[PDB]
Amino acid sequence: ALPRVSGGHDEHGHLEEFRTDPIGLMQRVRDELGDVGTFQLAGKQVVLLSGSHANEFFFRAGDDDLDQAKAYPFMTPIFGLRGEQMKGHAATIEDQVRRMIADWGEAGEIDLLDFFAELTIYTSSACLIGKKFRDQLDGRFAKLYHELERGTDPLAYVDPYLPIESFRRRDEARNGLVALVADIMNGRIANPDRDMLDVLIAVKAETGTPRFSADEITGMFISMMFAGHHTSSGTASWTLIELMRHRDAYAAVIDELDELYGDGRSVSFHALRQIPQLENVLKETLRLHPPLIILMRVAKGEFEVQGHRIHEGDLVAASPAISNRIPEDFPDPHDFVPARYEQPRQEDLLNRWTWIPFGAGRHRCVGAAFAIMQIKAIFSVLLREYEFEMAQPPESYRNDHSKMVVQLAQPAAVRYRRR
Ligand code: HEM
Ligand SMILES: O=C(Nc1ccncc1)[C@@H](NS(=O)(=O)c1cccc2nsnc12)c1ccccc1
């Protein structure tokens, strides 16, 4: 029997705690057991790995050893990048941001979750599907997509179809998205530049009838946008929050942006090049607030890690939330220190197996370049156009960890004023 963390005396073991304070649970696993420890998620044992040694095993393991295929049961009901194009995407993102703030005026107040959740729906759809498709979208799409993400309660590890309100809303939201897509398809029929939707609409089945239904197309689009939406949305929100919490960093970023853009080149040029201060703020934001706090796998065989035996069928997990703060690897792990990424320390590069907001090894984030470029493009526009201030106590900004998809809790109010 592998070492088991304390508690977990509820009906589904540690499931209830996982649904309320997953980070505290995972930290207790490490504090009590070390690099290899377990907790019970309903009828499934989760082997939580942490530390460089254990993480190296996790990230260097291929599909034949650790598989992600059936590690996330909450996604089944929901589903149903090249540098060459990066310059174009940067310009697209700049355009989407300018469109989102077009009605801001001289001063006002926004809720970060509402703002960035909607903005990232537009940037994601425009870049991945096409500008033509994004132009046929409005706030409704973002609202429905949010419901999908809110439908990821860990109870899915018991059963993804339990009769609970969040799952009911998840299913209703997906039907709503199918209807929006169907409306767009019908709109193109009556009122005819092409995008991915046009490509799918054109395919015919072995009978002359359209191959893909609105439902199938919607599932494809939902899946294409799922990796980058909540992650980019949360990262943008927390980047702004930490800049406001640390005015010295904010000031340094502003001076840097004003100096860099002084060469007269566009955001599509600069968002693909170094913006030092902002990049380090982003790295530190990701270390402290990793959008994915836990990564899951299903063991396909028997492996030994530090004397601990892992058997086939076992759920195996790594945690950016916990690993990103190991005190031995990151001096003063709970403090916001962008300087830890400067050439002298480079703590992100030095800790290859523990600085994992973007994963590592064979599972390196393929969208990281795009995500970093997006943050650079977004803030190149926002910070040069407006000044931001917190509208609530600095310590009151927090994440909601009740669903597998972590999202900012409300309120998250910020005030702006033209520069
Ligand atoms: C700030 C935003 C993002 C964060 C923090 C993030 C984080 C991660 C993490 C932690 C991993 C490793 C997951 C694992 O080991 O199971 C990863 C892998 C990956 N990410 Fe992202 N990601 C982000 C945005 C994106 C975007 C925009 C895309 C889509 C274009 C994307 C596509 C992928 C893919 C395909 C993998 C490879 C998975 C594998 O090989 O197992 N990511 N990402
Ligand atoms: O893995 C998830 N999301 C994600 C986002 C960005 N980068 C990497 C992963 C997501 N599970 S998923 O939707 O099945 C999924 C999407 C894309 C690539 C994947 N590789 S493995 N699973 C993938 C998720 C959301 C919330 C908590 C954990 C996992």
From Swiss-Prot:
CDD domains: CYP51-like. It holds the Pfam family p450. GO terms for molecular function: heme binding; iron ion binding; oxidoreductase activity; sterol 14-demethylase activity. It comes from the Bacteria. Its cofactor is heme b. The keyword Hydrolase does not apply. InterPro entries: CYP450_sterol_14alpha_dmase (IPR050529), Cyt_P450 (IPR001128), Cyt_P450_CS (IPR017972), Cyt_P450_E_grp-IV (IPR002403), Cyt_P450_sf (IPR036396). Gene3D superfamilies: Cytochrome P450. Its EC number is 1.14.15.36. One of its GO terms (biological process) is sterol biosynthetic process. Inhibited by alpha-ethyl-N-4-pyridinyl-benzeneacetamide (EPBA) and 4,4'-dihydroxybenzophenone (DHBP). It catalyses: a 14alpha-methyl steroid + 6 reduced [2Fe-2S]-[ferredoxin] + 3 O2 + 5 H(+) = a Delta(14) steroid + formate + 6 oxidized [2Fe-2S]-[ferredoxin] + 4 H2O. Heme b binds at Q68, Y72, R297, H363, C365. One of its GO terms (cellular component) is cytosol. It is an enzyme of class 1 (oxidoreductase). Sterol 14alpha-demethylase whose physiological substrate is not known. Accepts electrons from the iron-sulfur ferredoxin Fdx encoded by an adjacent gene. In vitro, catalyzes C14-demethylation of lanosterol, 24,25-dihydrolanosterol and obtusifoliol, to produce the 8,14-dienes stereoselectively. Belongs to the cytochrome P450 family. Homodimer. This is Sterol 14alpha-demethylase. It comes from Mycobacterium tuberculosis (strain ATCC 25618 / H37Rv). The lineage of its organism: Bacteria, Bacillati, Actinomycetota, Actinomycetes, Mycobacteriales.
